Symmetry: C3
Subunit: 445 residues, 3 copies
């Protein structure tokens, strides 16, 4: 719905709320087959240019098949093995004797078919390319005689077109050791992906969600190479199942909060930690520290719980009361008052220190705001750019309401002499306990 933002002057941090999240909690695997032609070289005296073109493209087909064979003989392990057991188990099932013949029988008359494997998985299989029928019907009469038959020029062009998808799949599967993500249109055409979404056991609003966000679905999918066996090329496509839908999500933005003394070396800094995406999830909060783990479209966020931490919901209280005992709100400390800016969803946080020239401009009016020393904020309403030193940032012009929450910078509550300026993952209460200990070593003496 409405994206809103809140800047907290006291902690030099902002929270962008109103996003609807879709968290991946499951996988839906599907088998993708390509019917190949088990042919061995058939060479006869041929020299007309059309026969040469056919044998050349046919050698590129045989090399693609042998390349897929040496790729499946030794498949290198990936750091994603912890996220593909749902498809690797299917490659292991297909290696069973008689199972590849089962899917070859189910896709004998139609392109799509549900197949109950010998492990209880009712998987959906597809035959996206039929080269055994094309090579054995249109090409073999040309190459398996005493002298080779002459093909028409339309066949030469049609065979380069059909063989092309095989060659490109062999390129992607070869350079990535059998595991590719995102899933390209060569692995699965957009038409095939959308048709696979319609056949998926999900609600119509959820099919509409994945169909309206097919590129995000591709970036969160996997293509795993299985086996080439018995005139069958098989590989597993692992598509995301979003077990969490429309859950509230928010993005925390943090920036250094320093004191603004005029004598360098007498200033202390503080920055809230754990900036990133937060989503309500099953009575707790799912936190995503890495930036590429959440894809954003307008008000909607698509995250993968694979690289998340699970935090108590009280972690949100660091945004309303950071000194609050229900949650130990952590900060990092330093004496590095270097100017910077953070572009948020509806504005910009500016940490200006020293002699830095910080400003906020409108495209037609020029400079409309000059920041003084400290941490401040400006909304995108009327602001186009923000300059900090020699750097110019662009402000997101997305509609929403910003709220400037005034408050005393908490860095002012600390005596500089006893401040712990060296903490990376330290608590508010951790710093207060270190201050009680450093004040005790000087107070008693």
């Amino acid at each position: 719905q409405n994206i809103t933002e809140e800047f907290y002057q006291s902690t030099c941090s902002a929270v962008s709320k109103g996003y609807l999240g879709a968290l991946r909690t499951g996988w839906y695997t599907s088998v993708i087959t390509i019917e190949l032609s088990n042919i061995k070289e058939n060479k006869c005296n041929g020299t007309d240019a059309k026969v040469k073109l056919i044998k050349q493209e046919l050698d590129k087909y045989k090399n693609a098949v042998t390349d897929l064979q040496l790729l499946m003989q030794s498949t290198p392990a990936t750091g994603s093995g912890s996220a593909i057991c749902s498809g690797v188990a299917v490659c292991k099932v297909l290696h069973l004797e008689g199972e590849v013949n089962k899917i070859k029988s189910a896709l004998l008359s139609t392109n799509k078919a549900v197949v109950s494997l010998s492990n209880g998985v009712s998987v959906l299989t597809s035959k996206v390319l039929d080269l055994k029928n094309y090579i054995d019907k249109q090409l073999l009469p040309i190459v398996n005689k005493q002298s080779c038959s002459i093909p028409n020029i339309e066949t030469v062009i049609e065979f380069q077109q059909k063989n092309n998808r095989l060659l490109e799949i062999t390129r992607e599967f070869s350079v990535n050791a059998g595991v590719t993500t995102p899933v390209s249109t060569y692995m699965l055409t957009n038409s095939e992906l959308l048709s696979l979404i319609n056949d998926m056991p999900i609600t119509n609003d959820q099919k509409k969600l994945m169909s309206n966000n097919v590129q995000i679905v591709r970036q969160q999918s996997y293509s795993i190479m299985c086996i080439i066996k018995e005139e069958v090329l098989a590989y597993v496509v692992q598509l995301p199942l979003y077990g969490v839908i429309d859950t509230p999500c928010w993005k925390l933005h943090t920036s250094p909060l320093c004191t603004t003394n005029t004598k360098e070396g007498s200033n202390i800094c503080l920055t809230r930690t754990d900036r990133g995406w937060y989503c309500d999830n099953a009575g707790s909060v799912s936190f995503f520290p890495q930036a590429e783990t959440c894809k954003v479209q307008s008000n909607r966020v698509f995250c993968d719980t694979m690289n998340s931490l699970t935090l108590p919901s009280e972690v949100n209280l660091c945004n309303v009361d950071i000194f609050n005992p229900k949650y130990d709100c952590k900060i990092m400390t330093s004496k590095t008052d270097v100017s910077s800016s953070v572009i948020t969803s509806l504005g910009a946080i500016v940490s200006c220190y020293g002699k830095t020239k910080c400003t906020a401009s409108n495209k037609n009016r020029g400079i409309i705001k000059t920041f003084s020393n400290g941490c401040d904020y400006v909304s995108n309403k009327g602001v186009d750019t923000v300059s900090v030193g020699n750097t110019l940032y662009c402000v997101n012009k997305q509609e929403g309401q910003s709220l400037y929450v005034k408050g005393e910078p908490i860095i002012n509550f600390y005596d500089p002499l006893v401040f712990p300026s060296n903490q990376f993952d330290a608590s508010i209460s951790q710093v207060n306990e270190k201050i009680n200990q450093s004040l005790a070593f000087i107070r008693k003496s």
Copy 2:
């Protein structure tokens, strides 16, 4: 001009000077159009192989158009939004009613044309592919009758060639959610990029600079998908404007500086922080901490100010006097004396500790220098490789002059017992103040 280097034995750091910098300070946006054919399926009884090939390639054209349509319906946000407002504003301008008709009229007779949009931007537009003219003139008479007309085989091949650039642009725009960088030759041919440079409002020496460094220009450019509307495919190419030209730049190299005691656990280490590229910029220094933010060609550096910090010019005094009060020169401390080497522009810094076998060799003479324990340096004059433990590095054979600046290692000025061995972003004066405080807790008692 002449690249020179200076190794500082006192701080285990080196500075490579003499580079001429080109910093990005602006964007030059340009609209790239592809005239499409608004056709709906026209199917008649056709079976000759040439008609089938034409309808097959025509279906791949219709799917590319519908794929671009679902890509433009929901465009996922990128982390680069802070750097593309200059082009996103044009996509927003094109969505206005009547504006796409304006550029369609300006490019009605010619390929290139300057167009004054309805927002005051005099942008340069180009028509790089004309599919409406080709489909409506060469293909529609073949498919919009009672029975389909027969095309010659040259047309089938020419249509696969023309439709190819559309299909590849749809692949790049699809997998990257509409924002690609670098800009491929499919988005913009080298001929089109060089012609776009000649038409750019810049000096002839600056056009010669971008034309001689077109790959760096591509890596620092963006291609943003706009709209497919009214037989027009439009997307914005955002090219860099280097507001800073020929500015002096230098690269700081740092390596751990430890003491060389024979009893492990009694040694302290120190490393200068903020290694990377520095450029003089508008009365201050622009620092680039990330390595991929500066592309290097011979004596020339191309940086993006988007990921830079602005520092006072006194930051250079950490290279001549690190104990100098005009700038608080920061270090990080530890007790981790692990051997390593850093390949600089004209030589190699070697930090050798413990039992590590450190050496510098010439390809034909073998080992020409054996490093003892501590931090040392060797020039590329006569040296080909440097070995530290089981690792062999290659020395850059670029011509320049190295200067070995002798000096006492500053790690020797510190009493080990009271050294702060746990600092990440700590100042020289910060460590000295912590030493005055740790000496006061034991001195009084």
Copy 3:
């Protein structure tokens, strides 16, 4: 042989042993040539569709040649320069006058040939594409007359096929500033790579190793653009030489080890540092901290010593006795008891703290183990998944034997009040010395 694992309950760490390593210690360079046609535009009045198709593809050939020329005029430096001196030296040798004519003479009658350059390097050269013969024999009679001769349609298709590899090599060399890795099948076909392996001065078991792991060989190879000169396109392929073969390797996995008090803020944490791959190497241990520097296939590991550290073999004693004085076993400390899990080679380490719901399940039985608070471990025997909070990990189903080494968590030997909770690269003995100093400031008073 047999992959085994050992979980150390005392340190919340696991070691996966039994891997056979192949470390890169050398480079084998090879020159790859493409015979080009030195032609200038030859235009005559031509309009038959076949002549147009030929001149169109011929312009794409001329632009690929001029694009390679502006790519070789200014070649941008890469961060890999420290790993390609073995090939850059060959590009520098080829630029000598008369040397490109030497390899052009050796490959005058055959495709492959060993050439002794004028620098003592007996390099192996290959001619993978012959465009000078094809353009000058099949195309020039069509375009160098008063009126252009008419080519047959097979030639138009064959020329688009031959020119395709040139255009794709120009794309890869253009966007990557002349240095590509991995080496694609366009730079070197799998047939050409395997044939190049057979011709390499190595043992038959080592040729069998690289031939069975060609994708790992590609990912650890470089393609460097040299020169386009005198109807010759030359570029260097740098293939890895594994000077270390079948060396024992092991992977260290680490996870936070905290105390499990019921009052938050009273808990201290500890984590072993330096997780990653270790290999026995030349009397020392080669450590690889980055994850992408070692490619794994079953029991075999392929590492690059370029991004490794050399450690004494006593570093393995951190796995059997971390309090052992022969090696200073380092840890990092904090008070951040956030739950997490690490998927190992044969199981999973689980660090469960607070209210987190940690469990281990079997696909058909459901939850088979509930972890209590602390650091624990479960083998893959009977376990399919592990859930920590809202995150589900997949356990690797690889066969091997796990050993649970019981022991007291070492975090319990520390008094919380005087624990140093702020260390990043700190030693066991470092923490004990800081504890002796913090106990001395309170003990005397």
